[PDB]
């Protein structure tokens with residue numbers, strides 16, 4: 001089983017087997033209105049995160065879902081976002097691939 005950890009501190013976050021094909025693919029290369037560019041990978045489940053702020057629909061990369069910022073719960077690195085449906089209760093995470101390290105369970 002392949003595991004995703006926080007690249008900064010090694011906190012365990014998610015699993016390759018939780019990748020989620022939102023819109024057809026887990027990977028979305030996106031930018032926010034301020035011009036920050038991210039390679040986002042969608043996961044159905046994740047742990048080790050602290051969510052901050054209120055949910056927002058602003059410029060959501062996944063139509064019909066609102067986002068909340070997700071930090072590493074250990075080190076405070078910005079690891080991505082939590083998404084929740086605006087009209088149904090599904091949830092998932094969009095995590096910044098380059099802020100994760102993928103490797104074996106060990």
Ligand SMILES: O=C1C[C@H](NC(=O)OCc2ccccc2)C(=O)N1
Pocket residue numbers: 031032033036058059060061062067069078081
């Ligand atoms: O789906 C989304 C999430 C994303 N939000 C965003 O970039 O908000 C600003 C921000 C929050 C925290 C760290 C960086 C930028 C956005 O514009 N669309």
Ligand SMILES: [Zn+2]
Pocket residue numbers: 006007008009010011072073074075076077
């Ligand atoms: Zn961390």
